[PDB]
Write a protein that binds this ligand. Structure first.
Ligand SMILES: CC(=O)N[C@H]1[C@H](Oc2cccc(C(F)(F)F)c2-c2ccc(F)cc2)O[C@H](CO)[C@H](O)[C@@H]1O
Length: 149
């Protein structure tokens, strides 16, 4: 099982920066949408649904904006964010990269700085054969631009 960010090199585990464009203007009360399907994709390293991968997002995933409320959309369910439970499982068995069905909804001068981590999303992988060779990924979401209020 592997992933990449913006079509880059393969990632098997660990922490990776994910850079996102945010609305530069936000008014008190507005809602920011971060569509991570535009950046993070994952695939099965054998294909053919031979040793299917099972991935979910993990309890504790949170803003970094620590006081913000929000929602996290993952694979047909919208969870309160920060995550207080593990999400449903997405199964990945094709070698073709699958953009992750993942969106973050954020409700808050400069409020978000370019280059600062605004959320840490922990993803867990376990496959089917043997032990499933479980792996941990963390996606550190980073804004490419300032967001001002
Ligand atoms: C030890 C491990 O993880 N076996 C996983 C397996 O891994 C690979 C399969 C082929 C090629 C590679 C490599 F060429 F990339 F090494 C990997 C691999 C190994 C370690 C990683 F950290 C990530 C991918 O692929 C499977 C389907 O996806 C399951 O996931 C399975 O459990």
């Amino acid at each position: 099982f592997s992933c990449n960010v913006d079509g880059g090199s393969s990632i098997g585990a660990g922490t990776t920066s994910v850079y996102v464009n945010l609305d530069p203007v936000i008014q008190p009360g507005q809602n920011l949408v971060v569509d991570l399907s535009q950046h993070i994709s994952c695939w099965n390293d054998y294909g053919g649904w031979y040793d299917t991968d099972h991935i979910n997002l993990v309890q504790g995933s949170a803003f970094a904006l620590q006081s913000y409320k929000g929602s996290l959309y993952w694979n047909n369910v919208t969870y309160p964010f920060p995550l207080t439970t593990n999400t449903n499982v997405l199964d990945i068995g094709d070698k073709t990269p699958m953009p992750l069905p993942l969106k973050l909804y954020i409700t808050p001068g400069v409020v978000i700085k370019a280059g600062e981590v605004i959320a840490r999303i922990h993803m867990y992988k376990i496959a089917t054969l043997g032990s499933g060779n479980p792996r941990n990924f963390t996606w550190n979401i980073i804004s490419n631009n300032s967001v001002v209020m």
